[PDB]
Design an enzyme around this catalytic site. Structure first.
Site, PDB file in Angstrom:
ATOM      1  N   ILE C  85      10.078 -25.215  -4.200  1.00 31.35           N
ATOM      2  CA  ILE C  85       9.601 -25.151  -2.825  1.00 31.35           C
ATOM      3  C   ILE C  85       8.468 -24.138  -2.764  1.00 31.35           C
ATOM      4  O   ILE C  85       8.609 -23.005  -3.236  1.00 31.35           O
ATOM      5  CB  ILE C  85      10.729 -24.768  -1.845  1.00 31.35           C
ATOM      6  N   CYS C  86       7.344 -24.549  -2.180  1.00 29.99           N
ATOM      7  CA  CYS C  86       6.135 -23.728  -2.126  1.00 29.99           C
ATOM      8  C   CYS C  86       5.843 -23.401  -0.665  1.00 29.99           C
ATOM      9  O   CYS C  86       5.209 -24.174   0.053  1.00 29.99           O
ATOM     10  CB  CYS C  86       4.968 -24.447  -2.794  1.00 29.99           C
ATOM     11  N   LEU C  87       6.318 -22.237  -0.227  1.00 27.97           N
ATOM     12  CA  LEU C  87       6.064 -21.726   1.115  1.00 27.97           C
ATOM     13  C   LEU C  87       5.366 -20.383   0.964  1.00 27.97           C
ATOM     14  O   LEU C  87       5.650 -19.643   0.016  1.00 27.97           O
ATOM     15  CB  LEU C  87       7.370 -21.587   1.906  1.00 27.97           C
ATOM     16  N   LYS C  91       4.781 -17.580  -2.214  1.00 27.17           N
ATOM     17  CA  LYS C  91       3.465 -17.754  -2.819  1.00 27.17           C
ATOM     18  C   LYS C  91       2.769 -16.396  -2.821  1.00 27.17           C
ATOM     19  O   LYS C  91       3.407 -15.360  -2.605  1.00 27.17           O
ATOM     20  CB  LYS C  91       2.677 -18.841  -2.065  1.00 27.17           C
TER      21      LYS C  91
END
Lengths: 828, 43, 148, 508
Positions: C85-87, C91
């Site tokens: 998951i890239c939030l 990041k």
């Protein structure tokens, strides 16, 4: 290929269970009698035992109890069959019509489970809350009685004690409780468990583990206010209630074994008991009343009442009248009297009920030379043994004449020239302290007009005389010659010590014109697994004199014998031997056949020999006159336990299995390889529900002259352990198909009691295989076609094409079928 | 003395299956495991 | 190692106060290898199902965001087949102020609703607004069919 | 002792009383105390085949030829077809001496009992039939055998073929992968009903360890791929795919993902293993204590690598799997030191009903209280007569003696008593002469060599009935007939194939 027809000529007469209660109505007193597959309902009234309705079920009744749950005006009947077709019945009478309604029904078999040695046991909670069942070892099936719910969810409960003998539901307990006696390496014990329905397990009971007499074999739950239970053994009777413990060991009881009981007083003060010898006891429960209102049991008392037919079940009815149900002997209706007779017996017989079974052997003979055979049976056992001369017709249909023998008969044959019956028998004598044996009662052998004893030393003192312990029962066998008119015991030859007579033949041997009596015996010893010795004795009866013409020593037991075209054919353990009658009047061996496990049953037709084995099923042999030896033509590879064999035709061979099943073997005519010709194919299968004991070609009906085109060919009678007498015939394929189609239609019209499927009832069933019936027609079902209403008959004949004898099938009509059945129903 | 006064019911003594029984389909051992499992959900 | 020194202390508070629908724990004594047990937050379309989360704390932590990977196959509007998951919080936008405790709630809250402003699969966005019905019944099935 | 020990008493008593309802089954079974294999024949000649077993109904006998490519089908002719030859011979033994008569029968005894019917060749691509693999259908119509073929050393198999999941095992050097096939053969005709193939697996055909049949449901455990294939056996003997358990638990799992994610390549753990993980998690959630939380995550890695080793069907829809360490399943380490987790799984519902540790006393209580349900032997007879700790008091006593002997190690006792579980399908014989109710003996002799002759004592009287010796006056194998009095004892020494026949001879 094979098309047979089985009908019943005499419904079973032995009594398996008897129960009494309020069934027809709340005011009537009903007596219910279970005779294998037949349920009889009687009303206890002034005039006697009025019959009400006799109902036959599609099963072997194994449990029968009456109970009345809350909201029921009259009691309900719960029946479980040996095939586990549980049901709950209700009695309804609408006008003159009497009906039995199946409130609940369903099968409760477990595909996995070891059947218990002591058999099926059924118990009902006194409050009518649940039904216990002990079918398989280690499990205790339960059936809650939710009135509102539509699916009675029976569930098994794990039971730690594996070898349970008897189990009962106790009285006066808040929650359902069971008391039972079980066996284990430490002996026999009595234990109690509380049944918790919701949690579905057993909870610790209010009692303690105990060790009791090793012979304890029956439990009686004493009703309120005593509570507790009574344990009956071989030499003691005890009462348990919490810590209260009593014991009595009267010397009178030990002489026999108690096998039945019944409650007379609802308070449980007075209890009936019966034993093997036929003696009837009375158990008294004396109560001491406390000053605080607590009833405490004081002591037990056992008092002999008299003698009765060897009892299987007792049922006190009312006003001192007791019903005694017996398998080995006639069922009685005795009266208990205030004052004893001169002999000190309070028992007075009022009525007796006929009981042919257990038929052990029989012969069809024509006394009057009129073509009417008079079946003669070796019925009963022990003091109930007798000969029944079953004669068809009037001059209802069956007229039976009894000839008591007071000893067990084993075999019978008819010698026309001597006008006498040769009968084997065996009374029981106890080894007296004097060194000999004393007969317990006078019997036919001891009351013979003339007597003789075998005097032979073929068996030397090589065998040591074992411990002749005082009091041990011993069987003494005799050959009785019985006149054909007065049935007196003209002569009674006795056999050697420990010698058992097993087979009997009356035939001419070879060129000799004299007729003879031939007996095959076996020296039996208790500690010997199998007999290693035997004899074949030839007797001649002339001018009232019995002569031992010749003897013969054999290395085994002569299980069976039969005359084979002027030669004697005898089976010895695992051997089948053929003997010749030399001019010197001696038996000479001709040929042997050692390929059997145990040759128990033999039959012959022409040069063919049908051999029934103990466990390896049927085997066909042939005699080679040119070579003088036996050729094993074919055999059956299905391992059935046999109990009787017969040869219907040169190609069809009939047998009876130990599990109450019939089957028909046939010679493989489609076999090409020599191996394929050595296999006997099974073409018939049928569940009869009776342990057939003998087959005998014959017929009680006058032999029709010129009617060689009758629907049926041949006639074979057979007698069962339950007194049933059935007839077997062969059928043409056209008729078999016609009746087979009719058979299925009937099952859609007639509602079976308990809603048991007929196909399931007659399905072949053993420990190995279970298959639907094939090549057999249930004659009983067909005969019932007459007693149904006319519009019901019309339903079966619908859309059915029937052949009127012209070779083509036209639209069938009921009247046409009536004629077909009427011919069938008159062949027995 | 002990045979007197026997029970007498009458002085003139002699002068549409609403339910189905279905055995539980699950084998007993499984029933123990299933029932124990349901306790975990409650616990 | 700043990560080990900081995380050791943070274990006492988090285990003493396990946040609802979000829990985890250490492996042995090491910090670079951890696991976590995440439960579908109540009222979520994945409610009931329990998801195992692979969580790795780098030695460079907290100057780099924590490594997160889903070990349970979940059809989510923010995570692809690799379970990552890239939030922004996961990041470069990550900051040392945030701790291992907050991420679960941010992830736990994020499970409830998509972030279609930057979605990882466009098919959901069309289905998310046009006909979410297809996205729910199937989303219910996936958790019912895998996490159960 | 009852004076009814003689056959005559039993035969006469049977003619007057059939007994209480449901007891007639035991009325006949007692005859086995009067009929028994009292006579022995030593060193019977036989074809150069490998004897396997009887059929449950005892009609057919199966053996494997020396080329392990064809199945020999023999028909049993009965234990009474050699009485003609032995007439005049006394005693309990028949030494393989020098007399021409004894030589004549020894070279003729085997053919008397067994008749050759069919020889079907099934392996055709270098496969070799396993001697210890054999299963009979519930109807007994068909038999099931498996053939194995070692794979060549080179070229090495593709990575995506050898490894098809993240939980796949790493093959060990001593036991390289193989290409397996399973065959269903009709016993009556010898026709090959159907065959299925498995490529690059490691399935233990020996003793059916990797196989199990319940009624008509067949289960195969693929240790290499940690996957279970389930097949349905039709009456025709034709395999039908049921479902596959492993990375996915529902047959349609792959279909749904393929459309969305058409795709060792996937790091998600197996659907089944997730359920086992959930159960161990939810159970650990009940305690709540940090300890239980501490242990769960501490051993998560060690627990996540657990691999299936055995299996067996408790019913048509339940599997009793056994789990153990990856090293042990490859035969490198001793299991006792490694905890083995037993799991009950529902095929249709797809949840883990229960999970028992190796030292789980709860499981032990179930085993001894339900040994009959675990064994699931003699399933081919509707009226079964099982013998076990949960079916006979005397069988139970031996169970207590073993446990009490060890205690007088409680934990170690639990360790070994569960070593046998799970059991192998069709490993027990329903021989009445082995039934403990009728006869007494020591179970140790038959389930290192027992130097003493096996003695059978009747339980009613405690008297000796017959002896069995399997040597010339070192592995011994006995094969009793299911019901009839016949038994074969095979003694193996290096390459010697010694066969003795035990049959009933009426001592004359």
């Amino acid at each position: 290929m094979s098309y047979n027809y089985v009908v019943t000529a005499q419904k079973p007469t032995a009594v398996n269970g008897c129960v009494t209660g309020h069934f027809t109505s709340a005011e009537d007193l009903n007596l219910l009698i279970a005779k294998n597959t037949r349920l009889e309902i009687y009303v206890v009234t002034a005039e006697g035992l009025r019959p009400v309705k006799e109902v036959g079920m599609y099963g072997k009744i194994a449990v029968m109890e009456l109970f009345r749950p809350k909201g029921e005006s009259k009691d309900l009947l719960f029946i479980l069959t040996a095939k586990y077709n549980a049901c709950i019945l209700e009695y309804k009478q609408s006008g003159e019509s009497i009906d039995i309604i199946t409130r609940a029904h369903g099968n409760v078999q477990d595909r996995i489970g070891r059947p218990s040695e002591t058999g099926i046991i059924g118990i009902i909670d006194p409050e009518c809350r649940m039904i216990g069942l002990r079918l398989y070892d280690g499990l205790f099936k339960v059936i809650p009685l939710d009135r509102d719910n539509k699916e009675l969810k029976a569930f098994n409960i794990r039971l730690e004690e594996l070898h349970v003998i008897d189990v009962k539901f106790l009285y006066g307990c808040q929650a359902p409780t069971i008391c039972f006696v079980y066996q284990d390496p430490q002996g026999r014990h009595v234990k109690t468990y509380e049944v918790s329905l919701r949690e579905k397990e057993f909870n610790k009971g209010p009692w303690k583990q105990e060790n009791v007499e090793a012979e304890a074999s029956m439990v009686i739950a004493v009703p309120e206010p005593f509570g507790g239970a009574i344990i009956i053994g071989q030499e003691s009777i005890t009462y348990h209630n919490g810590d209260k413990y009593l014991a009595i060991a009267p010397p009178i009881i030990k002489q026999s074994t108690i096998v039945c009981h019944n409650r007379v007083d609802p308070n449980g003060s007075r209890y009936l008991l019966g034993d093997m010898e036929g003696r009837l006891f009375m158990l008294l429960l004396e109560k001491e009343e406390q000053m605080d209102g607590t009833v405490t049991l004081k002591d037990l008392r056992v008092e002999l009442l008299g003698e009765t037919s060897i009892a299987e079940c007792l049922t006190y009815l009312d006003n001192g009248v007791v019903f005694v149900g017996s398998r080995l002997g006639d069922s009685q209706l005795v009266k208990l009297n205030v004052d004893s007779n001169e002999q000190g017996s309070y028992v007075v017989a009022m009525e007796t009920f006929t009981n042919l079974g257990p038929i052990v052997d029989m012969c069809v003979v024509d006394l009057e030379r009129q073509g009417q055979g008079q079946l003669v049976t070796c019925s009963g056992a022990f003091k109930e043994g007798s000969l029944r001369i079953i004669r068809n017709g009037i001059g209802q249909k069956l007229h039976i004449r009894t000839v008591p023998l007071y000893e067990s008969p084993r075999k019978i044959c008819y010698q026309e020239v001597s006008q006498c019956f040769g009968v084997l028998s065996s009374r029981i004598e106890v080894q007296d302290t004097s060194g000999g044996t004393t007969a317990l009662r006078p019997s036919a052998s001891t009351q013979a007009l003339s007597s003789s004893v075998s005097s032979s030393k073929l068996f030397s003192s090589s065998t040591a005389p074992h411990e002749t312990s005082f009091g041990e029962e011993v069987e003494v066998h005799n050959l009785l010659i019985i006149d054909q008119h007065t049935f007196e015991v003209l002569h009674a030859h006795q056999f050697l010590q420990n010698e058992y007579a097993l087979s009997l033949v009356s035939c001419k041997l070879g060129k000799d014109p004299n007729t003879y009596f031939i007996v095959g015996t076996a020296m039996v010893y208790p500690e010997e697994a199998e007999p290693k010795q035997g004899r074949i004795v030839v007797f001649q009866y002339s001018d009232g004199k019995l002569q031992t013409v010749a003897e013969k020593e054999v290395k085994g037991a002569v299980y069976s014998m039969v005359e084979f075209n002027g030669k004697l054919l005898a089976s010895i353990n695992s051997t089948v031997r053929l003997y010749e009658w030399t001019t010197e009047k001696e038996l000479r061996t001709e040929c042997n056949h050692y390929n059997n496990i145990m040759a128990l049953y033999l039959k012959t037709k022409g040069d063919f020999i049908l051999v029934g084995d103990l466990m390896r099923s049927v085997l066909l042999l042939a005699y080679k006159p040119m070579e003088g030896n036996f050729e094993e033509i074919a055999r059956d590879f299905n391992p059935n336990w046999m109990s009787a064999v017969e040869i219907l035709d040169d190609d069809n061979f009939l047998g009876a299995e130990n599990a109450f099943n019939l089957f028909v073997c046939q010679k493989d005519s489609a076999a090409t390889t020599d191996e394929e010709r050595q296999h006997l194919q099974e073409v018939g299968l049928f569940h009869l529900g009776e342990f057939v004991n003998v087959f005998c070609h014959g017929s009680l009906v006058m032999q029709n002259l010129g009617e060689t085109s009758t629907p049926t060919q041949g006639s074979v009678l057979f007698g069962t352990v339950n007194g049933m007498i059935g007839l077997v015939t062969s059928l043409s394929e056209s008729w078999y198909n016609l009746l087979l189609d009719m058979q299925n239609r009937l099952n859609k019209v007639i509602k079976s009691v308990g809603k048991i499927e007929h196909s399931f009832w007659r399905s072949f069933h053993t420990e190995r295989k279970t298959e639907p019936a094939t090549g057999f027609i249930d004659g009983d079902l067909i005969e019932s076609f007459l007693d149904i209403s006319r519009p019901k008959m019309q339903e079966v004949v619908a859309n059915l094409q029937y052949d009127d004898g012209s070779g083509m099938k036209r639209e069938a009509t009921a009247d046409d079928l009536i004629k077909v059945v009427e011919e069938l129903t008159r062949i027995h | 003395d002990f045979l007197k006064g026997l029970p007498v019911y009458n002085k003139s003594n002699f002068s549409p299956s609403e339910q189905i029984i279905v055995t539980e389909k699950t084998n007993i051992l499984l029933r123990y495991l299933h029932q124990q499992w349901d306790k975990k959900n409650a616990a | 190692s700043t990560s080990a020194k900081r995380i050791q202390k943070e274990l006492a508070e988090i285990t003493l106060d396990p946040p609802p629908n979000c829990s985890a724990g250490p492996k042995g004594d090491n910090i670079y290898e951890w696991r976590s047990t995440i439960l579908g937050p109540p009222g979520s379309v994945y409610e009931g199902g329990v998801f195992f989360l692979d969580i790795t704390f780098s030695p460079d932590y907290p100057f780099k965001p924590p490594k997160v990977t889903f070990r349970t196959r979940i059809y989510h509007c923010n995570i692809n087949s690799q379970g990552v998951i890239c939030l922004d919080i996961l990041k470069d936008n990550w900051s040392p102020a945030l701790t291992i405790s907050k991420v679960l709630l941010s992830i736990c809250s994020l499970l409830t609703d998509c972030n279609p402003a930057d979605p990882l699969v466009g098919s959901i966005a069309t289905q998310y607004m046009t006909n979410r019905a297809e996205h729910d019944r199937m989303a219910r099935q996936w958790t019912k069919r895998y996490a159960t | 002792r009852i004076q009814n020990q003689n056959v005559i008493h039993r035969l006469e008593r049977r003619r007057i009383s059939s007994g209480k309802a449901g007891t007639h089954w035991h009325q006949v079974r007692v005859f086995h105390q009067n009929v028994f294999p009292n006579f022995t024949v030593v060193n019977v000649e036989k074809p150069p085949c490998f004897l396997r077993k009887f059929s449950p109904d005892g009609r057919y006998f199966i053996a494997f030829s020396s080329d392990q490519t064809s199945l020999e089908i023999y028909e049993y002719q009965g234990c009474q077809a050699a009485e003609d030859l032995l007439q005049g011979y006394e005693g309990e033994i028949l030494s393989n001496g020098n007399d021409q008569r004894s030589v004549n029968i020894r070279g003729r005894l085997f053919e008397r009992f067994f008749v050759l019917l069919h020889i079907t060749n099934v392996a055709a691509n270098g496969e070799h039939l396993n001697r210890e693999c054999s299963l009979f259908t519930d109807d007994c119509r068909c038999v099931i055998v498996g053939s194995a073929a070692y794979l060549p050393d080179e070229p090495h198999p593709p990575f995506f073929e050898v490894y098809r999941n993240s939980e796949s095992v790493t093959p060990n050097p001593r036991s390289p992968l193989e290409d397996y096939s399973l065959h269903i053969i009709d016993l009556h005709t010898g026709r090959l009903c159907d065959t299925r193939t498995f490529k690059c697996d490691k399935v233990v055909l020996s003793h059916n360890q990797g196989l199990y049949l319940y009624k008509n449901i067949l289960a195969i455990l693929s240790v290499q791929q940690q996957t279970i294939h389930v097949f349905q056996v039709t009456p025709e003997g034709t395999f039908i795919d049921v479902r596959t358990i492993g990375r996915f638990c529902y047959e349609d799992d792959l279909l749904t993902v393929s459309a969305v994610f058409p795709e060792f390549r996937d790091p998600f753990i197996n659907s089944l293993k997730h359920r086992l993980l959930v159960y161990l998690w939810r159970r650990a959630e009940q305690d709540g204590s940090a300890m239980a939380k501490r242990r769960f995550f501490q051993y998560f890695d060690q627990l996540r690598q657990l691999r299936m080793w055995k299996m067996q069907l408790l019913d048509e829809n339940h599997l009793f799997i056994k789990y153990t360490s990856e090293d042990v399943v490859t035969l490198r380490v001793t299991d006792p030191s490694q905890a083995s987790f037993f799991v009950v799984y529902n095929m249709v519902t797809t949840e883990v009903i229960a999970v028992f540790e190796n030292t789980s006393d709860e499981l032990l209580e179930l085993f001894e209280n339900f040994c009959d349900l675990f064994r699931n032997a003699t399933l081919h007879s509707e009226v079964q007569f099982p013998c076990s700790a949960s079916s006979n008091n005397f069988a139970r006593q031996i169970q207590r003696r073993f446990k009490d002997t060890i205690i007088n190690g409680h934990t170690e006792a639990v360790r070994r008593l569960l070593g046998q579980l799970p059991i192998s399908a069709q490993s027990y014989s329903g021989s009445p002469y082995l039934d403990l109710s009728l006869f007494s003996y020591d179970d140790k002799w038959v389930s290192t060599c027992g130097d003493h002759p096996i003695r059978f004592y009747a339980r009613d009287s405690g008297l000796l009935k017959f002896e069995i010796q399997a040597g010339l006056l070192r592995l011994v194998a006995f094969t009793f007939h299911p019901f009839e009095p016949f038994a074969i004892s095979v003694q193996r020494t290096n390459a010697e194939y010694v066969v003795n026949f035990h049959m009933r001879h009426c001592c004359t």
